[PDB]
Amino acid sequence: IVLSQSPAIMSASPGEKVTMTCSASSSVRYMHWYQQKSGTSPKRWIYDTSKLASGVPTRFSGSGSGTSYSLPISSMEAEDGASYYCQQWNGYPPLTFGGGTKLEMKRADAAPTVSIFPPSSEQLTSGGASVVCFLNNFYPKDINVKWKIDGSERQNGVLNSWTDQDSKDSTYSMSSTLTLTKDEYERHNSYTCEATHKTSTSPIVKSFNRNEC
Amino acid sequence: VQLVESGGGLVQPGGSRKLSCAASGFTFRRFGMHWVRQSPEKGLEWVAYIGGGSSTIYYADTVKGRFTISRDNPKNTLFLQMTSLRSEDTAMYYCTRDETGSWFAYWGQGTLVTVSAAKTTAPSVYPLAPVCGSSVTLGCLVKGYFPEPVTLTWNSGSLSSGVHTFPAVLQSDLYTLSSSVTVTSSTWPSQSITCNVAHPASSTKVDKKIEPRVP
Numbered sequence: 001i002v003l004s005q006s007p008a009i010m011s012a013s014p015g016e017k018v019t020m021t022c023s024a025s026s027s028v029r030y031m032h033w034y035q036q037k038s039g040t041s042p043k044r045w046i047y048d049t050s051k052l053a054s055g056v057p058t059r060f061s062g063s064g065s066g067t068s069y070s071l072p073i074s075s076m077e078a079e080d081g082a083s084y085y086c087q088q089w090n091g092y093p094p095l096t097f098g099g100g101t102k103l104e105m106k107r108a109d110a111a112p113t114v115s116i117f118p119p120s121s122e123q124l125t126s127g128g129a130s131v132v133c134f135l136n137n138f139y140p141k142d143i144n145v146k147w148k149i150d151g152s153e154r155q156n157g158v159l160n161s162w163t164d165q166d167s168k169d170s171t172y173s174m175s176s177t178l179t180l181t182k183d184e185y186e187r188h189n190s191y192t193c194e195a196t197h198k199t200s201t202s203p204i205v206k207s208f209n210r211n212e213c
Numbered sequence: 214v215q216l217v218e219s220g221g222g223l224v225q226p227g228g229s230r231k232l233s234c235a236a237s238g239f240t241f242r243r244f245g246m247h248w249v250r251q252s253p254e255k256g257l258e259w260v261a262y263i264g265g266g267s268s269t270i271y272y273a274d275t276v277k278g279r280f281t282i283s284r285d286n287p288k289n290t291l292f293l294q295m296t297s298l299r300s301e302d303t304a305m306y307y308c309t310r311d312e313t314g315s316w317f318a319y320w321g322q323g324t325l326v327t328v329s330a331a332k333t334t335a336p337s338v339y340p341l342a343p344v345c346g347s348s349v350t351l352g353c354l355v356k357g358y359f360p361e362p363v364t365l366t367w368n369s370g371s372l373s374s375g376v377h378t379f380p381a382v383l384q385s386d387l388y389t390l391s392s393s394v395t396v397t398s399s400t401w402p403s404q405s406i407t408c409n410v411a412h413p414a415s416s417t418k419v420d421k422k423i424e425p426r427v428p
């Protein structure tokens with residue numbers, strides 16, 4: 001039995017109404033909902049389609065019959081942001097789960113702050129070179145980093161990571177690392193971090209020269 | 214009501230491991246239990262069901278014949294024994310208590326199971342310090358470690374604001390992780406700031422203290 005949830009991700013501002021969909025391959029015996037806030041186990045939210053778990057707030061509603069069930073919130077809240085999962089039991093294995101709906105919190109556009117860090121002295125002694133770029137507290141989520149050495153773009157050996165939405169800010173941050181051999185790193189003087197975001201037409205640039213530091 | 218899973222670790226492909234769930238604060242022999250696992254790639258997947266009697270068992274089509282679920286009622290303990298482990302078996306595993314309608318009211322904290330050929334390796338931690346005035350950003354780079362998870366703390370966890378820790382990314386059998394911390398200029402370098410990284414698998418405990426540098 002296949003449960004299909006749409007949308008995969010959505011953004012809701014505070015004081016907004018939001019609804020989510022689970023679609024079932026075959027008529028379902030039981031439809032349940034869970035809430036997961038990342039880094040913890042999923043929590044019980046709604047059982048038997050319409051019934052609130054003790055401790056869930058009133059705004060949430062559970063509905064639908066047959067093949068289509070829905071989860072809605074009356075008014076969006078900051079605390080509400082989480083992944084929501086639908087689950088079913090038809091009296092026969094397997095018991096089955098949705099892909100899940102990720103609910104982001106909508107907020108004002110923000111521009112990243114960029115920091116570039118040269119390789120550490122210990123790392124050099126160890127015989128390797130790493131350069132890191134931090135892109136901190138920006139919205140919305142999609143973002144680009146480009147690395148330049150001595151004015152020349154390098155796309156190879158770069159790893160990028162994203163946080164989820166910040167607890168207080170509601171923003172995102174990204175981290176970029178460029179990894180070189182020490183000898184190679186010593187080939188070139190200037191290392192540049194270029195970050196491109198929807199906030200600005202022009203990229204935000206940070207750099208250092210291996211000389212001077 | 215509490216449920217505590219245990220028995221997780223790093224496992225060889227084709228290996229066998231056993232997990233346990235300890236149940237407290239309810240009449241155990243009364244209820245059915247489930248195993249559920251989660252992977253970021255494939256999310257939430259049901260594994261198996263065992264009745265209060267043990268008379269009724271259900272197995273996920275994927276785990277059939279390689280996994281056996283059992284319970285010990287006097288103990289209050291739930292068991293999942295895994296054999297012929299594959300890469301797809303890598304997940305976080307939760308024990309759950311079955312309720313009418315078969316929804317789960319109570320979940321365990323989980324144990325992480327990783328199945329890989331790759332060798333255990335300890336992280337090397339590098340402090341990241343600003344290059345040569347109204348704010349300061351610092352970083353810890355933790356790289357070349359297998360497997361997850363690592364724990365990064367700042368100042369023993371005393372410092373928790375303006376902290377970003379980024380999920381690890383795995384390249385060629387090794388994970389890279391980083392963290393950035395932002396504090397006011399009066400704060401650093403005047404008062405001390407340190408990066409504490411813990412790798413359980415290697416038993417590694419390491420501390421790096423950020424130092425301004427110049428030659």
Ligand SMILES: CC(=O)N[C@H]1[C@@H](O[C@@H]2[C@@H](O[C@@H]3[C@H](O)[C@@H](O[C@H]4[C@@H]([C@H](O)CO)O[C@@](O)(C(=O)O)C[C@H]4O)O[C@H]([C@@H](O)CO)[C@H]3O[C@@H]3O[C@H](CO)[C@@H](O)[C@H](O)[C@H]3O)O[C@H]([C@@H](O)CO)[C@@H](O)[C@@H]2O)O[C@H](CO)[C@@H](O)[C@@H]1O
Nearest residue numbers: 089091243244245246262264265266269311312313314315
């Ligand atoms: C995965 C699945 O299919 N789960 C469904 C299953 O739930 C199981 C069920 O087990 C009960 C339990 O062992 C016990 O019932 C006692 C009490 C109960 O403690 C509180 O209501 O209920 C009675 O008073 C009653 O009204 O029947 C009887 C009490 O003795 O005993 C019965 C036994 O007759 C089993 O031999 C048992 O019910 C059967 O369980 C088997 C599973 O082995 C199932 O296949 C049969 O169809 C059932 O008739 O109920 C437990 C309960 O606390 C929560 O549902 C649950 O933990 C067990 O997993 O059956 C549920 C009820 O039909 C259903 O909601 C689940 O989806």
